[PDB]
Design a binder for this molecule. Structure first.
Ligand SMILES: O=C(NCc1ccc(Oc2ccccc2)cc1)c1cnc2ccccn12
Ligand SMILES: [Cl-]
Lengths: 205, 50
């Protein structure tokens, strides 16, 4: 799982909702998480795929805590036909905080979009829960999926996704301390069971 | 609730460049890097869970 003793990722999903008529509803997941020892990756192998200026991945990893850093490899399900493109996530904490979720859409390692969502604790089942339900996808992401699906073969989509990354940083709004950081890398799934994923711990050496 | 998004001015152009890098490799002047497959990553990075 992705999480520290300060915050844990419980669920993540990026989806496409379609409502053919008032009696028909459809939901397609492109990627999902939350539906024993993690493998490690040398963070120096991926620094170039993420921003490295004031407030970059190398900078945030150096400041730490280093156990909050994860690299997620996704195999996105693109087998899908009014529509809503959204993202649903849920975090868990033992302490009541105000969290800030930064999602950076990166192209060639450079930030292009930044979604920033301030979320508040809701005490459910003995702990604090931070939920982001149906967060609209940005126009860059919507058009990106549309253009990816438009390619004639899967190998071509994997080549384009080679320069596409997302950096997710969850921070204590008051403390400015990194609670969780997930560097996301993508490939197109080619399985009957659809979307798959692998999670790794990011390490110094 | 409401969210705040900081989009870049050349977003449409950057998205088109992300695709044109693969569609025209000798044409698009995009940054070059080591292919992920050729990097020192775990064998599991390219063998999806079964
Ligand atoms: O990554 C995140 N949101 C952005 C996003 C947008 C679209 C998308 O669908 C794709 C479809 C095809 C190809 C590529 C992407 C996937 C992710 C995000 C937000 N909170 C979390 C928590 C854990 C892990 C990730 N996140
Ligand atoms: Cl998004």
């Amino acid at each position: 799982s992705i999480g520290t003793t300060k915050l844990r990722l419980v669920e993540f999903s990026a989806f496409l909702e379609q409502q053919r008529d008032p009696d028909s509803y459809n939901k397609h997941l492109f990627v999902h998480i939350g539906h024993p020892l993690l493998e490690s990756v040398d963070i120096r192998q991926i620094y170039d795929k993420f921003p490295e200026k004031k407030g970059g991945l190398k900078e945030l990893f150096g400041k730490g805590p280093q156990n909050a850093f994860f690299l997620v490899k996704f195999w996105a399900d693109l087998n899908c036909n009014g529509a809503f493109y959204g993202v649903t996530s849920q975090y868990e904490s033992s302490e009541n905080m105000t969290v800030t979720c930064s999602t950076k859409v990166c192209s060639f390692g450079k930030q292009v979009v930044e979604k920033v969502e301030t979320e508040y604790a809701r005490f459910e089942n003995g702990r604090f829960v931070y939920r982001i339900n149906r967060s609209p996808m940005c126009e860059y992401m919507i058009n990106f999926i549309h253009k990816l699906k438009h390619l004639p073969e899967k190998y071509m989509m994997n080549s384009v996704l080679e320069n596409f990354t997302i950096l997710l940083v969850v921070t204590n709004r008051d403390t400015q301390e990194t609670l969780l950081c997930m560097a996301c890398v993508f490939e197109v799934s080619n399985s009957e069971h659809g979307a798959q994923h692998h999670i790794y711990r990011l390490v110094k050496d | 609730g409401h969210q705040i998004v900081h989009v870049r001015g050349d977003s449409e152009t950057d998205l088109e460049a992300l695709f044109n890098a693969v569609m025209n490799p000798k044409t698009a002047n995009v940054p070059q890097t080591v292919p992920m497959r050729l990097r020192k990553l775990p064998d599991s990075f390219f063998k999806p869970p079964e």
